[PDB]
A = this chain, B = another copy of it.
Amino acid sequence: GHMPLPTELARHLTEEKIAFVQRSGLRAEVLEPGYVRLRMPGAGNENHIGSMYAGALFTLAELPGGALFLTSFDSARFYPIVKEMTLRFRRPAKGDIRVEARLDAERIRQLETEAGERGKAEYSLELQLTDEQGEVVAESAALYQLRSH
């Protein structure tokens, strides 16, 4: 079905399940069906020139893929496969950086219909990572393949 895990529990999962992610201090601000918002703290994630390291920005952009899948898709029937991800670093990322990712229920229905019928469906997430002033510091594009069990 599409019943997401109880929120508070899902937040701990998102922030702690993967040690690599847990060590970065990544926090989940919102975990809803069709909408996730995460925050990567600047502290501890700085690079060699006073801004967020590219790998931390990548992690922030990558996580919504799995988080949004769990809150929006029927995980008992399908599973996601990430084919590739592209990051564009537009400006120095200073302070805490956030990202929002959306996929409405209608889109999920179309995708799962296709995945169910043909065995797989392709979809993507194009996100904007923003700083405290709302400026876009980086943009990501991730190509996913919805696969049926």
The answer on a CB contact under 8 Å between B44 and A20 is yes
Copies of this chain present: 2
The answer on a CB contact under 8 Å between B62 and A82 is no
Which of B20, B46, B54, B83 is A85 in contact with, Cβ under 8 Å? B54
A56 at the interface (CB under 8 A from B): yes
A12 at the interface (CB under 8 A from B): no
* In the complex, chain A residues 50-89 whose Cβ is within 8 Å of any chain B Cβ: 53-56, 58-59, 62, 66, 79, 81-89
Query: How many interface residues does A have (CB within 8 Å)?
Result: 31
Assembly CA distance A113 to B49 (angstroms):
22
The answer on a CB contact under 8 Å between B89 and A55 is no
Q: What are 19 of the A-B contact pairs (CB < 8 Å)? A: A18-B46, A20-B46, A20-B47, A20-B53, A20-B55, A48-B66, A49-B81, A54-B58, A54-B62, A54-B82, A55-B55, A55-B58, A55-B62, A58-B59, A58-B87, A81-B89, A84-B89, A86-B86, A86-B87
Q: 8 tightest CB-CB pairs across the interface, nearest first?
A: A55-B59, A84-B88, A86-B86, A58-B58, A20-B53, A54-B82, A23-B23, A17-B48
